Design a protein around this ligand. Structure first.
Ligand SMILES: N[C@H](CCC(=O)N[C@@H](CS)C(=O)NCC(=O)O)C(=O)O
Ligand SMILES: N[C@H](CCC(=O)N[C@@H](CS)C(=O)NCC(=O)O)C(=O)O
Lengths: 219, 217
């Protein structure tokens, strides 16, 4: 079992939880609970950069979200089949990560700044990100983003579709190919099990977890 | 000659400018001088997500800084031999990237925030990132970060080592291994010409260029 080091939150670890489940890979989680547990990881020398997420896979203590995601995607052929298909997967997913940063930020902002920032997410979703991904899908009518075969870009885009619906159900309403991508992926046996109740998938940020985060990562 | 679309600043284009010259590749730069030079790009449908950098390469109009670098690095075999070397290169370069964001964030701030934002970079440089990259060289004593060969990881770190030096010259002083990597990578024939005067290598952010920035985007 590769091992997942992080607090018990979506956070930066969540996109790795998604990818491994979609690859059929059982993993293990070791939840940081205090700044002390975290300090322990640093002092043991497990964290190259004194930060989490960290994943122990195949001999390595991997840090940096992208590095972990890259490795797992190549290991299970979810990173395309040539240098050109990587180009498209990387374009799409860096696009996906960008809308992600805004979404995480909002869940960590104060009540005061929350309206302005969601209005900015709503705006960029409908006008910038969703049309672009809808366009890709139409250009070829194929069931996946790249090479007509399951990749990470599909896993990551559908992860993001679930956050948008938590923020505003009608942002996907004029985008029918994303509507049906959302559907099909969700139904691939590995993503179905991951989506079902009691899986390792994490709920939205709420005040008590925000507290915990504040005190664990002493920021 | 693939074609770089960005303004006449470092920004997110610079790590791409550095990697290409280090690899030998001559490239074009078509500069964005105005809010409508960019508006144009969007309108022609050049920018997947309405943004730049964008690099016309091998038939693709590539956006996203990480997608562009990833491609260039693979094409020119600076991305490791196998999947496993890749993960070491990836962990490494993303670490360089986080202190990268700190240094760019500083350059776009007004002085009212700078003093402080610098104090943070210094603290993180000496106690976090520099020690991390020393420990990797010390452990293998080899001339490059990964696989006993030049990879993009050596390239990014040396670039970053160079901005640190503009900002506080003595941060690197207790790190004779990086101190040493800096010299070697810089005397590499390709990296030597890019470091020469007159190259496509970009000058530090200043007000003039900041005025342009606020104004184009
Ligand atoms: N480049 C990021 C950095 C990760 C990061 O900043 N991790 C946070 C938790 S969300 C952390 O460990 N904070 C503790 C610290 O920086 O000292 C990544 O994708 O892993
Ligand atoms: N994902 C980044 C995003 C690029 C980005 O935000 N670029 C700015 C210039 S530094 C831009 O084009 N801003 C216009 C906008 O987002 O509307 C990348 O690596 O390309």
């Amino acid at each position: 079992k590769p091992k997942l080091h992080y607090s018990n939150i979506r956070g930066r670890m969540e996109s790795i939880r998604w990818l491994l489940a979609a690859a059929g890979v059982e993993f293990e989680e070791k939840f940081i609970k205090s700044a002390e547990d975290l300090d322990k990881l640093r002092n043991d020398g497990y964290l190259m950069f004194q930060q989490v997420p960290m994943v122990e896979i195949d001999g390595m203590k991997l840090v940096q979200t992208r590095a972990i995601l890259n490795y797992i995607a190549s290991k299970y052929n979810l990173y395309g089949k040539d240098i050109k298909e990587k180009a498209l997967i990387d374009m799409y997913i860096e696009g996906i990560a960008d809308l992600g940063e805004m979404i995480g930020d909002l869940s960590f902002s104060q009540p005061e700044e929350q309206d302005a920032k969601l209005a900015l997410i709503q705006e960029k979703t409908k006008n910038r990100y969703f049309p672009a991904f809808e366009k890709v899908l139409k250009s070829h009518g194929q069931d996946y983003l790249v090479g007509n075969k399951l990749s990470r870009a599909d896993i990551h885009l559908v992860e993001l579709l679930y956050y948008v619906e938590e923020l505003d159900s009608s942002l996907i309403s004029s985008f029918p190919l994303l509507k049906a991508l959302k559907t099909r992926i969700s139904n691939l046996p590995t993503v179905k099990k991951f989506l079902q109740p009691g899986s390792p998938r994490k709920p939205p940020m709420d005040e008590k977890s925000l507290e915990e985060s504040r005190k664990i990562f002493r920021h």
